[PDB]
Design a protein around this ligand. Structure first.
Ligand code: MN
Ligand code: MN
Ligand code: MN
Ligand code: MN
Lengths: 198, 198, 198, 198
């Protein structure tokens, strides 16, 4: 079975950057949608695998990636956010940011960059490229997962799907994206960071 | 130059199905975004064509389709909607619907079908397949145009991009999709229809 | 376990249309490659499913579709070919061809059409669209299966991957495509046809 | 007008690695195909741009990228190959290879890696990522150009489209890929390299 994470703060705790109406729905109506369909599909995909049924296995695949990836994209997100989060990453992570984007503000535009240009629905990502032992920004389509689709390890991800900001910023994706920095829980983005080791 | 169509009714005129806050923004902040970037890109793409510069031509391509298709997808949409629109297509169009989906409610389910399943951002489409002289439902990704990407002729399209319903239906795409029928200006969907001739 | 079909004729039996060097390799070196990797992957995909491991499940997906689809695309192919095959489809199938493409020669160009324009590697397909009870030509990318990716039922498929003709027609895909008609086992393309029933 | 480059050696000059039957056809029948269709399409695309005809512009797009990118992918290729080419990149380029893949054999494996895994038709690429001032291996689909589609600068590319090796290595892509090293004209791959400057 797969289950919906409780988010590490109330809905309320990310005001004013992200309002609680958006957190209310992102977690409960949105993320829960994916977990449940992940479950129905994975269910169906251990049945069809078992029969060796390669066309219904291939047919259950976009379903599996949308909800699969939609479950794990949004599960990393809540953790990347926190009220006593925010500011700039201390220590090691910061230094890697410095070593790879030149400076934290250069790193910040480079990620607003990726995120603000997702044509349609998708995500912006600060990832880790462990074959090259460095940071790496990537943007992903729909709920297409960073590691499931590129092999890069997710440290920080930004949802730019309209359901993530619209009820608040309306058409202005980059306003959302500016608010977002203030709740970025660098203490966890670092934990993910450290996990990766050279 | 490309210019933003005025929509054929005030924002207000599609209440309660689509509220005027949504119409206000879809036309003004959203569609206008695409026209203007269409223009900057087409500008740049007659410069680079002129230099025979095939890599910057290929680079301006997703930009051109997003805003190109985003301009023409949304320009057909306003025309497919009207207050004294709605109900059931009379005459010829209805009959083709009957001949191709069996009945208008079978046709309606088949198009909610397409639309409600757009993984991510995209559109549901009642099109015309002129190589086979019949109707044809198609769903398109992002602002990927029906005829620019499939050759099918657009008669009726439904935006299922979240920016089309979210401020009102929130996570409930199919509620939007049920409201939508009541403003469907069949008189124009028919005009597009007739244009196609066998 | 998945196993390689024996092909229903010797390599030799499709001369001169397709030479036996090509049949030798298509079946033995090519198709067998896919079956074996289908097996290793499906193996790995019942392990990771079992652990509920959604990122390695999503990572095994292009592997599964390439070899999955590559196994079932090529398994339908051999059956669509035969020496005492060829000519035009008798009875019902022919009539559906007449009803959907106007005539067998109109149907033949419409399928050379699809096949000859596969940008890169892929397949041309005479399929069945069972939601609309009619024939339907479709072209698929790489070893992307007709029914696994579109829901259409495969009656006749043409490989236009270069490995299918190159050792013989070299750069001339459409020469291959003309030869191909002469070995088209219409007796089986019909059996697939009939299976579909309205 | 666009014109076919003469290749910098006779067909013959890359034996035994790539045979002259393959060079004969790659340059003459294959690359020439793309130049000519580039030309017809670019022609049509300055007509339709001129009329502001956004759906026929979007329709001429896959045509333009296939032949556009197919023209420029194959034009860089001939230059990356030479008889008095081969071996090990001297100086600066070598050092960047050392700095980015650890060693030239690690770099070689990493690029056979990319190339040998192109599902279907495509290319493996040693590129330059000028926003990060370093080397970067990328693999591209069909004739999808490195810089036109990723912004990375092409220094060395390997065609793994079957038309590049099949008449010689048949199903064995990696044999082709091993032969390939021996004709790699490092003197030019370096010139492209140096052009990029930090
Ligand atoms: Mn989301
Ligand atoms: Mn819209
Ligand atoms: Mn094949
Ligand atoms: Mn080539």
């Amino acid at each position: 079975k797969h289950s919906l994470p409780d988010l590490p703060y109330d809905y309320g705790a990310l005001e004013p950057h992200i309002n609680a109406q958006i957190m209310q729905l992102h977690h409960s109506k949105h993320h829960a949608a994916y977990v449940n369909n992940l479950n129905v599909t994975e269910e169906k995909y251990q049945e069809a695998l078992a029969k060796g049924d390669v066309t219904a296995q291939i047919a259950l695949q976009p379903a599996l990636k949308f909800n699969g990836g939609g479950h794990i994209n949004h599960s990393i997100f809540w953790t990347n956010l926190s009220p006593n989060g925010g500011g700039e990453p201390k220590g090691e992570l910061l230094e890697a940011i410095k070593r790879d984007f030149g400076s934290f503000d250069k790193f910040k535009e480079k990620l607003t960059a990726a995120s603000v240009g997702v044509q349609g629905s998708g995500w912006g990502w600060l990832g880790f490229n462990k074959e090259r032992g460095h940071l790496q920004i990537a943007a992903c389509p729909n709920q297409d997962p960073l590691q499931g689709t590129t092999g890069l390890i997710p440290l920080l991800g930004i949802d730019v799907w309209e359901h993530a900001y619209y009820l608040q910023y309306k058409n202005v994706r980059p306003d959302y994206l500016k608010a977002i920095w203030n709740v970025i829980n660098w203490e966890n983005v670092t934990e993910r960071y450290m996990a990766c080791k050279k």
